[PDB]
């Protein structure tokens, strides 16, 4: 099953082959060695992080 973890910020972003965003996630409590690329549909109510990254 999936595990929800708390996000600290978004570090970078890219497109998948289907034109949807994927986001490089800094996880709360962890450093840059644990960053993972996550598709947008993994994210729950993360619009503010996305706006903060695009804003910035």
């Amino acid at each position: 099953s999936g595990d929800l973890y708390e996000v600290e910020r978004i570090v970078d972003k890219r497109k998948n082959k289907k034109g949807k965003w994927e986001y490089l996630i800094r996880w709360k409590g962890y450093g840059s060695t644990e960053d993972t690329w996550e598709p947008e549909h993994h994210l729950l109510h993360c619009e503010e992080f996305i706006d903060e990254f695009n804003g910035l």
Partner: peptide, 5 residues
Amino acid sequence: FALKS
């Protein structure tokens, strides 16, 4: 929160 792969 977000799912972690």
